[PDB]
Symmetry: none
Subunit: 89 residues, 2 copies
């Protein structure tokens, strides 16, 4: 084998907001491009806690990894009820 991985570490400074929304948008498309099942890998990622659920195609794997699966899931739950007509406090 040859695990060649050098993540230079971009580390974007916090300034953006609602980033989780762009993160999953990106992650979703990443698997669409790679021919995988985005939903299946995302659901598996949050409730199993392992970065390898998201294929290393795009910075998406890093983006999702820089957010807590707890945090992301809260956002999922909030949005679910929000567009369902509920304003979350």
């Amino acid at each position: 084998m040859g695990f060649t991985d050098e993540t230079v570490r971009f580390d974007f400074d916090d300034n953006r907001k609602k980033a989780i929304s762009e993160t999953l948008e990106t992650v979703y498309r990443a698997l669409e491009e790679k021919g995988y099942n985005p939903i299946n890998q995302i659901v598996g990622y949050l409730l199993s806690g392992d970065p390898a659920y998201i294929p290393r195609y795009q910075d998406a794997r890093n983006l999702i990894r820089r957010h807590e699966r707890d945090e992301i899931m809260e956002e999922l739950t909030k949005y679910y009820l929000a567009n369902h007509g509920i304003d979350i406090k």
Copy 2:
């Protein structure tokens, strides 16, 4: 080296659809009546697999419990991107 498709097909017969959406609506209402934060308790339920995360005020705790955490979580994931302008199956 463990190339195994795991489509369990353990699909239990349920006659409802979009019920999860109605269920979380119920659960959300349940915590507001109890003076808690609906999101905090729901997020814990799905990723911990512990029914005790939902307070026992209303039938909501029973309703959510009839649904698998995975089932709801995938629905959350799809819906998140769906109303975001993405069409998911």
